[PDB]
Amino acid sequence: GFKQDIATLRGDLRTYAQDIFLAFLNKYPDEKRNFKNYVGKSDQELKSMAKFGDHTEKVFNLMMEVADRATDCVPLASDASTLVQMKQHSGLTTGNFEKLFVALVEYMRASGQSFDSQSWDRFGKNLVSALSSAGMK
């Protein structure tokens, strides 16, 4: 289930974080508008860029804590407001997060690992509602 998936992802976090982020970046090319440094680079070149690995792992470190602190895939309001008020998130809209989670759920279903794919879909939707309620446009 959802709780076990957090453990599965944490068990190989840097790999999963990179592959999910790449799936997101390649499903939605226009999203590199927020990642100017990742343009014109194949997946293997991205994985050799120090900040690509370091930043993506830190994102997914934090995502797993927001998931872990959730109840029934509903994140805490204190976690949602942290994501909105984050300085690095200044220009983001909730579409950014909705698209991230479509990619992540698509990746899980294609994985052959036994993820609770529907729970992550719910979690992504619930995170998006909590981002709007916390002020994100």
Ligand X SMILES: Oc1ccc(Cl)cc1Cl
Which residues in this chain contact ligand X in the complex, by CB under 6 A?
A: 21, 55-56, 59, 100
Q: Which stretch binds ligand HEM (CB under 6 A): 5-13, 39-47, 85-93, 104-112?
A: 85-93
DSSP string computed for 38-77: GTT--HHHHHTSHHHHHHHHHHHHHHHHHHHT-BTTB--H
37 labeled binding residue: yes
How open is the CA angle 92-126-3, to the nearest 5 degrees? 115
Residue nearest to ligand HEM (CB): 96
Tell me how many residues contact ligand HEM (CB under 6 A): 15
Nearer to ligand HEM, 55 or 125 (CB): 55
Binding positions for ligand HEM, 114-133, rule CB under 6 A: none
Whether the Cβ atoms of residue 99 and residue 127 lie closer than 8 Å to each other: no
